[PDB]
Amino acid sequence: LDQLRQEAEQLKNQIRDARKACADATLSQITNNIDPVGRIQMRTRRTLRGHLAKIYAMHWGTDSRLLVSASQDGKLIIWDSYTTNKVHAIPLRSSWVMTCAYAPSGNYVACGGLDNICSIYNLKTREGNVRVSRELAGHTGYLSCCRFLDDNQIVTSSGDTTCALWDIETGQQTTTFTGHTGDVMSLSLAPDTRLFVSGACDASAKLWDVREGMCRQTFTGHESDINAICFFPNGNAFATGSDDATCRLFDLRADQELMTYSHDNIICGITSVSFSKSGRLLLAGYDDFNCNVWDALKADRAGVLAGHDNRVSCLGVTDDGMAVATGSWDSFLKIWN
Amino acid sequence: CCRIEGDTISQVMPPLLIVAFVLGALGNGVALCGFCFHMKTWKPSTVYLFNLAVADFLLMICLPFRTDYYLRRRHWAFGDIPCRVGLFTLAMNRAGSIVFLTVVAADRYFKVVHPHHAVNTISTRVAAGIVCTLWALVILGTVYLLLENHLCVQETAVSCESFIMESANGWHDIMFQLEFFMPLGIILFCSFKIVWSLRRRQQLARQARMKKATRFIMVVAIVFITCYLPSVSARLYFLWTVPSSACDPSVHGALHITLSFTYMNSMLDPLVYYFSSPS
Amino acid sequence: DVQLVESGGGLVQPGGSRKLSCSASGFAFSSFGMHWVRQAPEKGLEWVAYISSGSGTIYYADTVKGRFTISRDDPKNTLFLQMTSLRSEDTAMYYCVRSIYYYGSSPFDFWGQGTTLTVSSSDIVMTQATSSVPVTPGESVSISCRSSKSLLHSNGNTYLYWFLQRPGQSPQLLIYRMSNLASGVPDRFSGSGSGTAFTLTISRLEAEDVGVYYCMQHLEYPLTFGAGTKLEL
Amino acid sequence: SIAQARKLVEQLKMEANIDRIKVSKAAADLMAYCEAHAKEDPLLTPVPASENPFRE
Amino acid sequence: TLSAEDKAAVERSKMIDRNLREDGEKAAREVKLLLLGAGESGKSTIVKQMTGIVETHFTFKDLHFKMFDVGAQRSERKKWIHCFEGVTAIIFCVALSDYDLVNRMHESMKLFDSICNNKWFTDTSIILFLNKKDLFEEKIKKSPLTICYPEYAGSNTYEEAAAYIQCQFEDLNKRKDTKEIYTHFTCSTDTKNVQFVFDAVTDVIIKNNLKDCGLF
Ligand SMILES: O=C(O)c1cc(O)cc(Cl)c1
């Protein structure tokens, strides 16, 4: 009622006052004396040319050589990036796929989309073929992300304002995260796989706690829907890519916004965000048909990856940082180095 | 044989052929570069258009030497084998361009009149195989004058031509007549059926782009007929009344400039086809 | 589960044209390459033929080239091998080994039961040095295998496979590509080495480990096995 | 009902009771991590083609 | 320079490529239609002759159709509406008799404006179905159409009222040259609905074919 609304207003005012008090100097002032990385030159080393429709997601394997990509033709393809060979080709039940995942052990892959089901596939079977291990159902909205906690735990992000943690062996949600007021479109596991963040359509990102399930912090500052999120390699920060042509860097400990990656030239949103191995560079996949390598410490464009004829929808960096793979809406992938 | 008069041609023809040469290798090239550079996911129609461009490009690199035969009055620098290969490659490129025009017209007819027919689903490999078969057939049909001798050294002229003013010629003239009379019929049928079917639509007609398309359909056929018909007409005129028209001073010079008129069909084809597409 | 059963052996007069067959059931036969490996009675294994997935590649040993034929029937899930002009050397026991090739796969993983046939009366040389060695439970025994050519390819993986033939049953795969441990093999077995120097160690062995051990190369055809190191007691 | 308002108030009060660190020192820590790990970043500092897996 | 295992892996990859090419070639011959409406507009009725997305598969005149119904996808429409960019046509179904109150004709107009004047569906022809014709006739025999259209000047006759409603719905689109709207008075218990859909699909197919040859 009125008193509860007043209490919420005063609590948010106190939160804003505390955030303003804890802010003493933006990192731009601290970083002015560091040497810029300069121009970044990237060349298309390989071009995976197997798909036949729009590509919506891809995930690097833990060995930094195998990767799995999902496209609208109802096919899951596992690539050998070194030789551009097709290790596997998994025909999905529903061609409307908006996410993909690769297990850290490499035994399983995950798929999901408009079918509201996050299926799991068994790569290493005695029969020699890939079968579906378990279909996870219970989301009332479309699937937008899915990450493998381990061989037995998977956490998914749905379009019904809910994030859930599953259990492949049993098939039911262990925990349910309900803090958002809009569609959730992204997910990013912490380096220690103890926390994670989600990017929702209400222009806010919440940091959860998978062990018990509750929103630790809520980060705001965006002006439109958040389309992609990614943890900093240190695990104490993350970056968000939204539809207002901006990328922003938040810090978990300080609970504030650090920098914004914006320019007057670009006006389209950001569809994918990923860091580098050392966290110095930020890669964002715009709708301008090319990616920008933002210098994450100085917010200056260090280079452009312009080799795609359509909107870049997925973008990832290997564990060792040796390559970055971008998949756009033309049925093409490109390995840059 | 018969050493015929000569003069205006050497003055009239080389300008035209130079003209051709210029536009032709220029467009046809840019067209080939566009086909192989920016056109991705090659559809069976793109294969036909690219092969038409290739045959046209070969024809457009062909002329220069004939230009020489015209710089000089009627002499040639080279001897037997260069003429055997030169006339053969000229005829082969002309026949290939005509065949690919017919193939393009038939493909458009199949893609607009029977959109659900299985030929619409032909993969790129099958189209490439059909194109290779057509090319092999054209080469096999044009090898005949490669394996023959046609140098008429009368007085001091060093002439080398198969459309000579001497009692016509054998099956080469029949092939020359057929290579226009069959493709003309095929192209006319395809164009008429395409126009009729696309105009029978009332919801689709009032868009002005289905009107631009049906304008181009008739433009292509009109260009083809208005560029090739004089060649057949003049050659048939020479075939007729051979006892009287034998080595006529003006029939030569009408015929040889009329084939020059035939030439720039090749130069203008890229402009009509690629330079009018929205891609 | 996976089952490879072969039939067609018996008694053949010299100069016969008898055909062997092998029926597979329990796995996706259409995506596996099939080999035939014979074993003369008082001898070791010897590669015979090979056919890939889709029957696109077929290799033959130099001894049987021109007399043997190998073919598959994928809808029937059966593998054939037709022999012509049999000679007294062709007396052996024939196996139906299976192998699937991709990145990280384990070829020669399952071996058939084996059928016996009796007829009435630049390759890489793989030498296994010792042919017999007595062992006791609780010890650690290392088997040594050697090759002429270096088995380290430019990719970085050495193609050497370890097999174990228990008394009275088919051989089984232990280690593929000289370092990886096969599926179902306990941690006890371990292997390492380098080019032209390969060793397999059995730390803290026990019973049901007796039998001959064979080492095989896969760098290039024809595949060659070792003499076989026997373990007793 | 009005249980949503109570839930939101409880969530806000739980969120507000956290320890906040200075932004400048967090930025310093981030820059220190980036500088420390910049030695092994092939994308930042290109690796020679001798050991580049995608050299071809 | 490839080893034996590398050559076999390359062969397996080539076989996979062949299978993928065959699957894509077979899939490119199937007509995909997106079904839209206001929930109670009558999508279940039109789909009857043949927990997220629901796909309906049927064949007409040796042509393989595929109708997708979003149904209960109660989420952000703009967040997943671009997945359907490239469908042959859009079947927007609305009820002619649903104009009483709780009014919903304005909601249908808003939905049609959102779908038609969309950046993704710039060139995708939209098929409009006006069902519940008999119920609309019964309603108009008693209740005048002025309760829904304040600026209406006509008699309470089914013909002119239906024509007026169709004209108002058709005048919603902006791009009147690169996109065509097809209107059909369905709820006739015949095969006319599927025939009309087939005709529109054939027109779209002819338009697409007129693009690969450069004739466009
Ligand atoms: O084969 C030709 O293209 C050709 C032959 C002639 O005898 C004269 C001319 Cl103008 C062209």
Residue numbers in the entry:
A (entry chain B): 4 to 340
B (entry chain A): 6 to 284
C (entry chain S): 1 to 121, 124 to 235
D (entry chain G): 8 to 63
E (entry chain C): 4 to 53, 182 to 233, 241 to 354
Which lines from the publication concern this structure?
In this study, single-particle cryo-EM was used to determine four structures of human HCAR1 and HCAR2 in complex with the heterotrimeric Gi1 protein: HCAR1 bound to the subtype-specific agonist 3-chloro-5-hydroxybenzoic acid (CHBA), HCAR1 in the absence of an agonist (apo) state, and HCAR2 bound to the subtype-specific agonists MK-1903 and SCH900271. HCAR1 belongs to the hydroxycarboxylic acid receptor family and displays high homology with subfamily receptors HCAR2 and HCAR3. Similar to HCAR2, studies have demonstrated that HCAR1 suppresses lipolysis by reducing cAMP levels in adipocytes via a Gi protein-coupled pathway. As members of the same receptor family, HCAR1 and HCAR2 share up to 52% sequence identity, and their overall structures are very similar as well, with root-mean-square deviation (RMSD) values of 0.8 Å for the Cα atoms.
Subsequently, the HCAR1-Gi1 complex was assembled with scFv16, a Gi1-stabilizing antibody, in the presence or absence of an agonist, obtaining the cryo-EM density maps of two HCAR1-Gi1-scFv16 complexes, bound to subtype-specific agonist CHBA (3.16 Å) and apo form (3.36 Å). The subtype-specific agonist CHBA was stabilized within the OBP through an extensive network of polar and hydrophobic interactions. A detailed structural analysis showed that the carboxyl group of CHBA formed a salt bridge with R993.36 and a hydrogen bond with Y2687.43. Besides, the hydroxyl group of CHBA formed two potential hydrogen bonds with E16645.51 and R712.60, and the imidazole ring of H2617.36 pressed against CHBA from the top. Such a binding mode facilitated the formation of an “ionic-lock” between the acidic residue E16645.51 and basic residues R712.60 and H2617.36, further helping to maintain the ligand in a stable pose. In addition to the polar interactions, both the aromatic ring and chloro group of CHBA engaged in robust hydrophobic interactions with several surrounding hydrophobic residues, including L221.39, Y752.64, L923.29, F168ECL2, I2627.37, and L2647.39. Notably, a comparison of the apo and CHBA-bound HCAR1 structures suggested that the addition of the ligand induced a large conformational change in the side chain of R993.36, thus facilitating the formation of a salt bridge with the carboxyl group of CHBA. Notably, the HCAR1 agonist CHBA mainly occupied the OBP1 and OBP2 regions, whereas the majority of HCAR2 agonists were primarily localized within the OBP1 and OBP3 regions. For the HCAR1 subtype-specific agonist CHBA, the bulky residue W91ECL1 in HCAR2 led to Y872.64 shifting too close to the 5-position chloro group of CHBA relative to Y752.64 in HCAR1, thus generating steric hindrance effect. Compared to the inactive HCAR2, both the states of HCAR1, with or without an agonist, adopted a fully active conformation, as the cytoplasmic side of TM6 showed a pronounced outward movement of 3.6 Å, which is a typical activation trait of class A GPCRs.
